[PDB]
Swiss-Prot record, chain A:
GO terms for cellular component: ribonucleoprotein complex; ribosome. One of its GO terms (biological process) is translation. The open reading frame (ORF) for this protein is entirely within the ORF for the RNase P protein (RnaP). The two start codons are separated by four nucleotides. This is Large ribosomal subunit protein bL34. Found on the solvent side of the large subunit. It comes from Thermus thermophilus (strain ATCC 27634 / DSM 579 / HB8). The lineage of its organism: Bacteria, Thermotogati, Deinococcota, Deinococci, Thermales. The keyword Nucleotide-binding does not apply. Residues 29-48 have a biased composition (Basic residues).
UniProtKB/Swiss-Prot annotation, chain B:
It comes from Thermus thermophilus (strain ATCC 27634 / DSM 579 / HB8). Transmembrane segments: none annotated. This is Large ribosomal subunit protein uL2. One of its GO terms (biological process) is cytoplasmic translation. The gene is rplB. InterPro entries: NA-bd_OB-fold, Rib_uL2_dom2, Ribosomal_uL2, Ribosomal_uL2_bac/org-type, Ribosomal_uL2_C, Ribosomal_uL2_CS, Ribosomal_uL2_dom3, Ribosomal_uL2_RNA-bd_dom. Belongs to the universal ribosomal protein uL2 family. Residues 256-275 have a biased composition (Basic residues). The lineage of its organism: Bacteria, Thermotogati, Deinococcota, Deinococci, Thermales. It comes from the Bacteria. Residues 222-275 are annotated as: Disordered. One of its GO terms (cellular component) is large ribosomal subunit.
RNA sequence: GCGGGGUGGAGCAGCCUGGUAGCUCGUCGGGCUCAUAACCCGAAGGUCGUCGGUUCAAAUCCGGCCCCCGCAACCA
RNA sequence: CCGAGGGUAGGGCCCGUGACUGGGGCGAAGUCGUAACAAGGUAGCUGUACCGGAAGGUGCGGCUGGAU
RNA sequence: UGGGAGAGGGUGGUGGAAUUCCCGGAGUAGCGGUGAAAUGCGCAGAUACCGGGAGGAACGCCGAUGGCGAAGGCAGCCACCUGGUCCACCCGUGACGCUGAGGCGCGAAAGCGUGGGGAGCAAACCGGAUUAGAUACCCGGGUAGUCCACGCCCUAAACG
RNA sequence: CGAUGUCGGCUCGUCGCAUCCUGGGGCUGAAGAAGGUCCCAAGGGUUGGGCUGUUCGCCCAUUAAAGCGGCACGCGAGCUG
RNA sequence: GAAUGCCGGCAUGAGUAACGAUAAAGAGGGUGAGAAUCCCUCUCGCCGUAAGCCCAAGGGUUCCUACGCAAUGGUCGUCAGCGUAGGGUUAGGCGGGACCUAAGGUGAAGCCGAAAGGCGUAGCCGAAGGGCAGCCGGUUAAUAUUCCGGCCCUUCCCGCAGGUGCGAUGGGGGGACGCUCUAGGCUAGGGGGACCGGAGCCAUGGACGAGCCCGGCCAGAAGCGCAGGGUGGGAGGUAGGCAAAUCCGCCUCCCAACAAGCUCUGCGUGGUGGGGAAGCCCGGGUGACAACCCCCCGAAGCCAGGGAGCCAAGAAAAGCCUCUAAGCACAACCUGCGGGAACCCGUACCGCAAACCGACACAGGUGGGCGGGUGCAAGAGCACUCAGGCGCGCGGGAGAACCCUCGCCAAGGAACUCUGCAAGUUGGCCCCGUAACUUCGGGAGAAGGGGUGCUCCCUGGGGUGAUGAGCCCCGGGGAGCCGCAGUGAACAGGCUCUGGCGACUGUUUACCAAAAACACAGCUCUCUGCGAACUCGUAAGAGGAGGUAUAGGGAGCGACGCUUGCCCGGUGCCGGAAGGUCAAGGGGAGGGGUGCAAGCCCCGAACCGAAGCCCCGGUGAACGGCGGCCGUAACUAUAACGGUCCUAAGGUAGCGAAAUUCCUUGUCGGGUAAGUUCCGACCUGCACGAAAAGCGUAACGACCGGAGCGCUGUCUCGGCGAGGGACCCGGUGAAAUUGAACUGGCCGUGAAGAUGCGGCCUACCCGUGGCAGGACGAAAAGACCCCGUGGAGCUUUACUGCAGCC
RNA sequence: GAGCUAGCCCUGGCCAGGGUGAAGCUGGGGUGAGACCCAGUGGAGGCCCGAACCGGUGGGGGAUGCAAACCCCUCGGAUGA
């Protein structure tokens, strides 16, 4: 049956991407936390 | 008027459509139309704020001239009468001798090929617009401004009419389509005659499909819901209302008046509506 | 199991607040009518379901026993 | 080939009968009222409508086959 | 051909009296209703009076024992459209007539459908009386309906 | 109650005897035939349908008879539901 | 040493289940240490509206080649989407960007909000929509509309020539639009040819033939032809298109009019450039100077912005054309020609799947185009088959029970069972025929029946062509032949009668309910006069609606038909400038503290004083509610009738043992041999009843009842057969569970159901295939029930508070 | 977090073939004129049958599955809410 993951490069970058995070206070505090934790990638990677 | 159908499907039994015989032109004026953005009942928050709306036929909006006092004295020929999907009334296409082209809602008896005019001197003739004070007391009238130069507010729907009953001072007394008696300012314009397409109320939609064409989505009774959805929701089996009949939001829906008590226009309403 | 009830022949008041039983109808006698009904004037008839207790005194307050309605009997 | 007729299928008319039901006629001395005949005690009758235990009542309009 | 009388019919328009409602004034202890009363209405200012307003229906006097219509039926006034009908003249056609099973149309009231309208009236219904009872007559209310438009119904003491 | 699956049916039985039938008896208000009643006896047998989820029961047509109970109201790691 | 503890390790179950679609395999010859599994060949089978081909998304080197087999591959492996290494993706024209706008998003102006932020016209962003210039063939192990070849084209810059009032973001035109149906003419595609080209072929009885087999094109600029689309011309006035305007709009006049002219596409032709089969021979070569033609079928595609009808009335913006304004007319723009210039990103490969979403090389899921032929009425259905692609990554045997999927069955034919559940039956087309009832459409494919192949003969009409031949499309008649059987295979309704419920098509608990539930047109009540009511929001602002009472919100009812009765005492809502109560505030009779005192300071009565509440009326398609007892008729029985108590009023019509009836399988009738169900009635309705609508209703229903016909392995009552498993052999090898176990029966005992205790009985040790009575077998710290002063959802005239409203 | 699912918005796309034959239109009849009837033409519809496509009615299988919802037979819709 149709499952929950239906990849979409545009949907990916526009929802979790760097610019979407930077726009909002909660999105910025995400990047702050993942930077503070040492995450190698602060945002999901997508090809474009 | 009111075209019937033979019962060759279950829904054709009662479905009636307008006869459209007054229409003389079946495609709008390109210069007078603009896209009518369907809202679906969603406001700028994206939230449904008027329930059960959406999914109707695409429509373009006809720019209607609800002023008419800004072309005072310039006569105009009635070029056509056209179907308008944004209103119950028909609309009339005017070719001003000025060369300008405007739409107005088509009053009853209006004939394509006649002239109309607007102003304090206009003949008391179907389709002409004059300040309310210059219109003879007793004549039916439509598309009435509620305040001078603010645009026609009352008696715009198909078949509707307001009658000038009397006047006192700067104000005349109208009987609105509802039967309310209201003082409206004499400088407010109005178009003599009643709005045409009076057969509009005898249309039998015929089936659920026609309400969907009109953009009206299915309405679900409060009694059909659960208590988390509605005062009337729940009960084992069917249940009477079991409290004063209420809306989804709690307020009583049988009789409870809701016009603001201290509204300033109260001073200008002579008698609340009838029936 | 829980609530109410039983009083002239009929249907009901009085019980709660002890001492006084009352209303409409019916019944009986008289009247009017040619006669009946209606109507009018008078009158009779209830020891208050039964027993036991309380009290100076019980239709009335407290227990039974009889009886008559009503309500309940749910989770499996 | 046609062919009495037999078989299968579906119709149409008539007859008999059927729990129950609907009124109808008739029936020496039943119960309820008194609608009509006198102005019958609200003049009657009427087509219709609605209502009521029952006769009937009432509305609308008509008729005189209504008295004084 | 020339004339006449008429609520003949249809459409649109319009006039005054009255009733109710509404508003302003004025005014006070009752009004109303009946056989008698009660219900009802009224000091929260009714009734009775004046002015203003809104709305529906019906047209007093003329009016008659009258007129027109095939009947049902038709009554303020005006204009339009239209039917019948009588008289005159003795001009034209030359029996072209009478009746009429079927058919078609018209058809009071009530009633029905879809809109509208709704003052007064009033089945149903409520109430007050009367009464043994009173699902009545009488009184206070009151919904259809009565009115308009379109479409049905097609009955009658549709009677001379 | 850190679970012992709950009615009825189907399937498969097995047991008890307070015996429905068949076998053996006494008594009879047992003439015969056919019954009644009690005693012995569990070897075998103890039908097919209509109705209802039904067990039960009622009924139809038969029968030598159409027995009654136990087995976690036998039997859902066998089925049905 | 226990915490269903935690982490790890290793056991048990066990050489057990399984090894992932039943489309299927066999041999030969290669390679290699090793081969069912890799390569080649031949044979066999499967898909063929795909299981073939091409795009898009997603994936991201998986592509090609060499080397390789430890792990990955459900077996094997020499093979691979695996390991290692090298190579591979080439564009002005294809897609996106340097163009346009859509929703939406963002947002100079502006607005709002404690902060964060919310909103917002323009503008900007935003595409699978608009717009825009490349077609065919060749080549690589791997890319190609990209490289090459042939033939075309676009824009930018500059220049020459000719022409013109040039010039924009601004004005205008245009772009520009729906649904259904559809004309003419083409193209794609396909069928046929006794014509044309071809390696060959003659078999096994016949055929050297008008034989079989193979192929018979593709692209192309200008021009031309056919087809269509688009489109009036001129003049006078002009106040409108927010300046101007010769443009556009409006008015008049003249001419043009199903035309024509002009213009733009499609198709054809077209210089020219390519392609070119079977077969044979080792991807190639040959065939080959390959041929390259005629007839027919023919689109849903093209001409296109075509046409008609309909209502539900069908984006925007740029490119483009025209107008003019500043400016400028040494300019600038238009047209033609010439030279030059033309950037960034993608391009491999998978792509209905082993490379994408499902933890797997997972029977599932995934949008667009092409999708050939024959026959079956048509078709994308079905059967077979082309091109192409596969046999599904464990096999070999055996021929048990039992399971799955399938085939047949004597006699019976629902006797099965909760139920004909399931499975039969019926089955397409043509013709005959078709009832109650109905809202006149329907019911209807009602029901029921007949026909169906092949051969010969006669003949009717249509398309094309030409009016004929040929090919093709509908037919009509006559005579025959064969078989058990002619839609001979495959795909393709069982029917009827009668109730309940819901009018109907629709909708729904994704993953146990598809229903009578929801919705629905329709009906009514109610609110709302517009800065509407209402809704979201603290707000601004939105929705409502660029709508206006024939409109919008809320509620109930639920097509339609005939109807919808009585109660306003209580609650709700509505109306009511009186009366009563009523807070803050006003008021200040009058007391108090303190001070020498002026004073400062506190308390405080009458009285005035909103909404609300009380009170007075209204109101039911508002919440709701619609009696009891006793008596009475000339047989009995029963009460039309009466008496009395109560109520705010005492259930009207219609219906009724009902989706409602407890007693109950009520009673009677029908159907049955038999009927707790069913249908029709009755009425003492435990406990129907009128918009939580009442009673009906044609049509409809994968709804739920009852019956009949038909037909059946449902059954009496089972039997046989097929295949996939199960069984055996080689390969690979789980799982839950598991205190340890050396783990028998009876009768007892025991915490009351004992392999484990007693007594007795029985019993050599170990397996394998089977069956499920026990191990109170496994699974899940019982969902039921209770307990916890445990939790949550929900309700209200519980308490208290808050939003909102007054 | 709406890459699942629910609704809405914007922009595109899809729905083989066959059947039924509404209005209108034309002609004919009819009438004072009509209504209306008849034939032809026409091609309407939450019409009919049936693939793609969207569903998920009944039954069987599956149940440490091919699969944490699948497979087979059957069945609903398929110009429309
Ligand atoms: K337990
Ligand atoms: Mg899903
Ligand atoms: Mg997706
Ligand atoms: Mg993407
Ligand atoms: Mg994308
Ligand atoms: Mg996206
Ligand atoms: Mg976002
Ligand atoms: Mg982003
Ligand atoms: Mg920010
Ligand atoms: Mg911040
Ligand atoms: Mg910050
Ligand atoms: Mg790093
Ligand atoms: Mg992130
Ligand atoms: Mg109709
Ligand atoms: Mg009809
Ligand atoms: Mg019209
Ligand atoms: Mg525009
Ligand atoms: Mg809008
Ligand atoms: Mg926004
Ligand atoms: Mg929303
Ligand atoms: Mg709303
Ligand atoms: Mg909505
Ligand atoms: Mg409107
Ligand atoms: Mg209109
Ligand atoms: Mg005003
Ligand atoms: Mg309507
Ligand atoms: Mg619409
Ligand atoms: Mg609803
Ligand atoms: Mg509910
Ligand atoms: Mg519910
Ligand atoms: Mg919620
Ligand atoms: Mg709540
Ligand atoms: Mg609530
Ligand atoms: Mg409720
Ligand atoms: Mg409920
Ligand atoms: Mg419910
Ligand atoms: Mg209930
Ligand atoms: Mg209630
Ligand atoms: Mg409420
Ligand atoms: Mg409110
Ligand atoms: Mg009003
Ligand atoms: Mg009393
Ligand atoms: Mg007392
Ligand atoms: Mg006392
Ligand atoms: Mg006494
Ligand atoms: Mg005493
Ligand atoms: Mg309970
Ligand atoms: Mg014979
Ligand atoms: Mg009398
Ligand atoms: Mg009398
Ligand atoms: Mg009466
Ligand atoms: Mg008074
Ligand atoms: Mg006073
Ligand atoms: Mg009025
Ligand atoms: Mg003469
Ligand atoms: Mg009449
Ligand atoms: Mg009274
Ligand atoms: Mg008369
Ligand atoms: Mg356990
Ligand atoms: Mg357990
Ligand atoms: Mg014996
Ligand atoms: Mg025995
Ligand atoms: Mg039992
Ligand atoms: Mg029983
Ligand atoms: Mg015997
Ligand atoms: Mg037993
Ligand atoms: Mg047990
Ligand atoms: Mg028991
Ligand atoms: Mg027991
Ligand atoms: Mg048991
Ligand atoms: Mg089980
Ligand atoms: Mg069981
Ligand atoms: Mg078990
Ligand atoms: Mg320990
Ligand atoms: Mg633990
Ligand atoms: Mg652990
Ligand atoms: Mg662990
Ligand atoms: Mg571990
Ligand atoms: Mg370790
Ligand atoms: Mg280990
Ligand atoms: Mg092992
Ligand atoms: Mg084992
Ligand atoms: Mg296994
Ligand atoms: Mg498997
Ligand atoms: Mg082999
Ligand atoms: Mg091998
Ligand atoms: Mg090997
Ligand atoms: Mg090979
Ligand atoms: Mg094919
Ligand atoms: Mg991957
Ligand atoms: Mg390996
Ligand atoms: Mg190695
Ligand atoms: Mg491996
Ligand atoms: Mg595997
Ligand atoms: Mg090797
Ligand atoms: Mg490569
Ligand atoms: Mg190039
Ligand atoms: Mg550039
Ligand atoms: Mg964007
Ligand atoms: Mg684009
Ligand atoms: Mg578009
Ligand atoms: Mg391009
Ligand atoms: Mg080209
Ligand atoms: Mg090529
Ligand atoms: Mg190379
Ligand atoms: Mg210029
Ligand atoms: Mg420009
Ligand atoms: Mg356009
Ligand atoms: Mg447009
Ligand atoms: Mg062909
Ligand atoms: Mg060419
Ligand atoms: Mg000008
Ligand atoms: Mg050569
Ligand atoms: Mg198409
Ligand atoms: Mg096109
Ligand atoms: Mg349409
Ligand atoms: Mg725009
Ligand atoms: Mg110069
Ligand atoms: Mg030029
Ligand atoms: Mg650049
Ligand atoms: Mg490439
Ligand atoms: Mg697929
Ligand atoms: Mg693959
Ligand atoms: Mg595989
Ligand atoms: Mg797969
Ligand atoms: Mg072919
Ligand atoms: Mg076929
Ligand atoms: Mg295979
Ligand atoms: Mg496969
Ligand atoms: Mg094998
Ligand atoms: Mg074997
Ligand atoms: Mg199979
Ligand atoms: Mg067979
Ligand atoms: Mg055979
Ligand atoms: Mg058989
Ligand atoms: Mg049979
Ligand atoms: Mg048979
Ligand atoms: Mg049966
Ligand atoms: Mg059986
Ligand atoms: Mg069959
Ligand atoms: Mg078949
Ligand atoms: Mg019949
Ligand atoms: Mg018939
Ligand atoms: Mg029938
Ligand atoms: Mg019927
Ligand atoms: Mg019919
Ligand atoms: Mg059919
Ligand atoms: Mg034949
Ligand atoms: Mg043959
Ligand atoms: Mg033969
Ligand atoms: Mg069928
Ligand atoms: Mg339904
Ligand atoms: Mg339903
Ligand atoms: Mg119903
Ligand atoms: Mg209905
Ligand atoms: Mg449908
Ligand atoms: Mg479900
Ligand atoms: Mg669920
Ligand atoms: Mg679920
Ligand atoms: Mg359900
Ligand atoms: Mg369904
Ligand atoms: Mg639902
Ligand atoms: Mg419905
Ligand atoms: Mg209705
Ligand atoms: Mg809010
Ligand atoms: Mg708006
Ligand atoms: Mg309905
Ligand atoms: Mg009917
Ligand atoms: Mg009634
Ligand atoms: Mg009340
Ligand atoms: Mg009240
Ligand atoms: Mg009241
Ligand atoms: Mg204050
Ligand atoms: Mg107050
Ligand atoms: Mg009450
Ligand atoms: Mg009954
Ligand atoms: Mg019964
Ligand atoms: Mg019933
Ligand atoms: Mg029921
Ligand atoms: Mg009941
Ligand atoms: Mg019963
Ligand atoms: Mg019985
Ligand atoms: Mg019988
Ligand atoms: Mg009875
Ligand atoms: Mg209700
Ligand atoms: Mg109910
Ligand atoms: Mg029905
Ligand atoms: Mg249905
Ligand atoms: Mg259904
Ligand atoms: Mg049956
Ligand atoms: Mg049968
Ligand atoms: Mg069998
Ligand atoms: Mg086998
Ligand atoms: Mg091994
Ligand atoms: Mg292995
Ligand atoms: Mg041990
Ligand atoms: Mg041991
Ligand atoms: Mg052992
Ligand atoms: Mg043992
Ligand atoms: Mg014990
Ligand atoms: Mg034991
Ligand atoms: Mg032992
Ligand atoms: Mg022992
Ligand atoms: Mg011991
Ligand atoms: Mg022992
Ligand atoms: Mg033993
Ligand atoms: Mg073994
Ligand atoms: Mg074994
Ligand atoms: Mg066992
Ligand atoms: Mg077992
Ligand atoms: Mg066990
Ligand atoms: Mg245990
Ligand atoms: Mg056990
Ligand atoms: Mg067990
Ligand atoms: Mg479990
Ligand atoms: Mg726990
Ligand atoms: Mg527990
Ligand atoms: Mg649990
Ligand atoms: Mg308990
Ligand atoms: Mg507590
Ligand atoms: Mg406690
Ligand atoms: Mg608690
Ligand atoms: Mg919870
Ligand atoms: Mg998505
Ligand atoms: Mg379709
Ligand atoms: Mg046909
Ligand atoms: Mg036409
Ligand atoms: Mg299924
Ligand atoms: Mg089945
Ligand atoms: Mg499962
Ligand atoms: Mg499946
Ligand atoms: Mg299937
Ligand atoms: Mg279908």
């Amino acid at each position: 049956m149709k499952r929950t993951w239906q990849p979409n490069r545009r949907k990916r970058a526009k929802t979790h991407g760097f610019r979407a995070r930077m726009r909002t206070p909660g999105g910025r505090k995400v990047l702050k936390r993942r930077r503070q934790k040492g995450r190698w990638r602060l945002t999901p990677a997508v090809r474009k | 008027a009111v075209k019937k159908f033979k019962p060759y499907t279950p829904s054709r039994r009662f479905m009636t459509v307008a006869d459209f015989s007054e229409i003389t032109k079946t495609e709008p004026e390109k210069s007078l139309v603009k896209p009518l953005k369907k809202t679906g009942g969603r406001n700028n928050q994206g939230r449904i704020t008027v329930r059960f709306r959406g999914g109707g036929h695409k429509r373009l909006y006809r720019i209607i001239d609800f002023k008419r006092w800004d072309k005072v004295g310039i006569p105009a020929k009635v070029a056509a009468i056209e179907y308008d999907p944004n209103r119950s009334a028909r609309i009339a296409l005017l070719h001003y001798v000025d060369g300008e082209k405007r739409y107005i809602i088509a009053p009853d008896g209006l004939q394509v090929g006649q002239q109309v005019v607007a102003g304090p001197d206009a003949p008391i003739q179907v389709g002409n617009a004059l300040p309310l004070r210059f219109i003879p007391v007793g004549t039916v009238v439509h598309a009435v401004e509620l305040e001078p130069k603010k645009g026609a507010k009352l008696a715009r729907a198909a078949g509707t009419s307001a009658q000038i009953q009397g006047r006192e001072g700067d104000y005349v007394i109208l009987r609105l389509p509802s039967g309310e008696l209201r003082k409206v300012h004499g400088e407010c314009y109005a178009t003599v005659g009643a709005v045409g397409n009076a057969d509009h109320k005898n249309i039998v939609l015929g089936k659920a499909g026609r309400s969907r064409w009109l953009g009206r989505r299915p309405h679900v009774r409060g009694a059909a819901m659960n208590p988390v959805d509605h005062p009337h929701g729940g009960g084992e089996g069917r249940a009477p209302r079991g409290r004063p009949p209420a809306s989804p939001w709690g307020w009583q829906t049988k009789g409870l008046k809701t016009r603001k008590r201290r509204k300033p226009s109260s001073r200008f309403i002579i008698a609340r509506r009838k029936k």
